């Protein structure tokens, strides 16, 4: 329910029933042999798991310190770690007798991931998306329609992600009998933060096993970018108990901390209730965020990261638009891997951290996705 | 050098030393322990091999006939099988003491794959590309420059693939001391058709093991799309001695075979010489390579590998055509039905597999090589199909 004081289930009574039903359904299937046989089989044959753990040899020699490994989630079907979550939540919903999936999206990336999972399982999929987001993300919207999903633009208020979230809550409230709300990150009321993190944990369990095979030891640092925080928890969570591993989350520094134009909820937001959870967001009411990485452009952050920060298990830092962009070009030229701009934040801070560390130390960076979707954006910038 | 009567080494005398040195190095390293260790390590950690074999249940049942499995080359780093070849050849060139990679590309996908490999190995990369093809493929070209590669537009001839290949050939002739010419399909002068096939054979080796594991027997048919024939030879080759295994190569039918606007070299082409090989080519009454059309840019290659010409002669493999209309429907169909957006080249294979399974019985099996992912083609498909 909670992670320290963070988390919770602060929703209108109308949503309490649907949430307990989700929580009970999850408790039953989570460890179920048959449900896990279906999920591991989709992740293998359909999604491509396991993803490799890659030694960035040339980048490492260039900077001069720590060995840099990349967890290559960029190679997941769809090009983004979000697939892991969406393909876990979709079959679950079908086991509860749901014929429909809804979800909201800002950058369009969870939109794509959900439409894909829906196509696979033959469920209807409706995606809420602010009309201003729709215009900015022409290609993700087309991807969604290609996969057979309906994209409902929201043409009220600020016409942004905040307006789309609310419209999806009102929808689910009306249609939970047959509809599952497929939340995209480790946010929202219990049990979503836990469910999402459990479905992304596969990343860390593989990474863990892959670095023991390659180096004979656990890593010294694990770096990962943080929007809501699903890829970060995914890779962090199997190492939470291992005291020797530093966990570093990298939030979107945007145009700089002092400009207002960033998405550093943990580093600069205040605690509050939002989206049915107690955590950090930028604010009284939500204030707008910004990031060149569209997936990091979300006012809030996960309550389990809020917790890890409070108890100091994990450290959180920022990287600017300019820093991520240079790391986008760096990894491309030096390793032949074009990273998602979200992932480039992690890479950019890994590059800074490596410089100050010893040649015998080890950083693993969660390369949360590939850069193909971001080519237009980088072309306007450069 | 030969596959029956096709293949050969039809290049100026200047290129014969370079091609002997390449053949000598390949025979030295092909079975070398360390070379294969490093190659397999890259193919695993950098490219993401193995790729899974995926059962498309929903599609199979909708059609109501033979089983359809997709070999998921769309998941390889880069989005396409091409990477398998590029990461085979680039280290080989380095071990030969070369510091520069050059390459032809028409769709831009091979040039991207070449750029990625050169970036990894820290080699210079020059990509020759038809000026008309540069204009039609702005994101693949941006990808190449992002990767550190220089792109060199070709304004000679019809400014298409054919001309890029010749300019590539002319450059290598001058610079072969330091430059390896990274040929991107099972084409070119010997030893390239053999080499490229050998580096794509991994696909069929994985598929053979995976289908045995999944079904307890070999496939009844295997379907791959054919431009130059790289991905098809890759999946075909480890099954060629398995006599019962049908092999089907699907070529671009374009607007229709009777329209001339297509790219079906094996079905409608004549025997000729181009690119330093003897194989099948699309040409007119006066011998010149005719322009090739397909909605799938990677099947614009105006000829085909000599080994496919050989397999067609001895009727080991069958070769068919599929139209733009048909491939485009398969692209939509696979996206809705399996949530996998295929490359338009691969959608040719799927389209044929969908036609073939319907006629076959429910206990027969078809492996389709899903050669690439469709992200690169979305601008094309939105223009063709429309903004829904
Ligand atoms: Na945030
Ligand atoms: Na052809």
Curated annotation (Swiss-Prot), chain B:
Keywords associated with the record: Amino-acid biosynthesis, Aromatic amino acid biosynthesis, Lyase, Pyridoxal phosphate, Tryptophan biosynthesis
Cofactor: pyridoxal 5'-phosphate
GO cellular component: cytoplasm
Example of a GO MF term: tryptophan synthase activity
N6-(pyridoxal phosphate)lysine: modified positions: 82
Transmembrane segments: none
InterPro entries: Trp_synth_b_CS, Trp_synth_beta, Trp_synth_beta/beta-like, TrpB-like_PALP, TrpB-like_PALP_sf
Enzyme Commission number, as recorded: 4.2.1.20
This protein's pathway: Amino-acid biosynthesis; L-tryptophan biosynthesis; L-tryptophan from chorismate: step 5/5
Pfam families: PALP
Reaction(s) catalysed (UniProt annotation): (1S,2R)-1-C-(indol-3-yl)glycerol 3-phosphate + L-serine = D-glyceraldehyde 3-phosphate + L-tryptophan + H2O
Gene3D superfamilies in UniProt: 3.40.50.1100
Highest taxon, organism lineage: Archaea
Entry function: The beta subunit is responsible for the synthesis of L-tryptophan from indole and L-serine.
Similarity comment: Belongs to the TrpB family.
Subunit relationships: Tetramer of two alpha and two beta chains.
Protein name: Tryptophan synthase beta chain 1
Gene designation: trpB1
């Amino acid at each position: 329910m909670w992670f320290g004081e963070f988390g919770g289930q602060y929703v209108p009574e109308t949503l309490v029933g649907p949430l307990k039903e989700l929580e009970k359904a999850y408790k039953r299937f989570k460890d179920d042999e048959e449900f896990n046989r279906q999920l591991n089989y989709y992740l293998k044959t359909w999604a491509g798991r396991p993803t490799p753990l890659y030694y960035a040899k040339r980048l490492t020699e260039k900077i001069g310190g720590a060995k840099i490994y990349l967890k290559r989630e960029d190679l997941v079907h769809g090009g983004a770690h979000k697939t892991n979550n969406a393909i876990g939540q979709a079959p679950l919903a079908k086991l509860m007798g749901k014929t429909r999936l809804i979800a909201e999206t800002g950058a369009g990336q969870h939109g794509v991931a959900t439409a894909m999972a829906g196509a696979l399982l033959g469920m209807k999929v409706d995606i809420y998306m602010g009309a201003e987001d729709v215009e900015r993300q022409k290609m993700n919207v087309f991807r969604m329609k290609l996969l057979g999903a309906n994209v409902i633009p929201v043409n009220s208020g600020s016409r942004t992600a905040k307006d789309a979230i609310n419209e999806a809550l009102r929808d689910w409230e009306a249609t939970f009998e047959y509809t599952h709300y497929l939340i995209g990150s480790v946010v929202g009321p219990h049990p979503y933060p836990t469910i999402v993190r459990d479905f992304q944990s596969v990343i860390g369990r593989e990474a863990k096993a892959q670095i023991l095979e390659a180096e004979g030891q656990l890593p010294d640092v694990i770096v990962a970018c943080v929007g809501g925080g699903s890829n970060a928890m995914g890779i962090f969570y199997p190492f939470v108990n291992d005291k020797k591993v530093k966990l570093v989350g990298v939030e979107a520094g945007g145009k700089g901390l002092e400009s207002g134009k960033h998405s550093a909820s943990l580093n600069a937001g205040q605690v509050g209730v939002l989206h049915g959870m107690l955590s950090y967001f930028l604010q009284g009411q939500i204030k707008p965020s910004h990031s060149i990485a569209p997936g990091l452009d979300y006012p809030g952050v996960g309550p389990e990261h809020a917790y890890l920060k409070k108890i100091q298990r994990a450290e959180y830092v920022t990287v600017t638009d300019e820093e991520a962009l240079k790391a986008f070009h760096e990894l491309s030229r030096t390793e032949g891997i074009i990273p998602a701009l979200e992932s480039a934040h992690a890479v950019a801070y890994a590059m800074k951290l490596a410089k100050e560390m010893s040649r015998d130390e080890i950083i693993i960076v969660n390369l949360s996705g590939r850069g193909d979707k971001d080519l237009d954006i980088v072309l306007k910038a450069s």
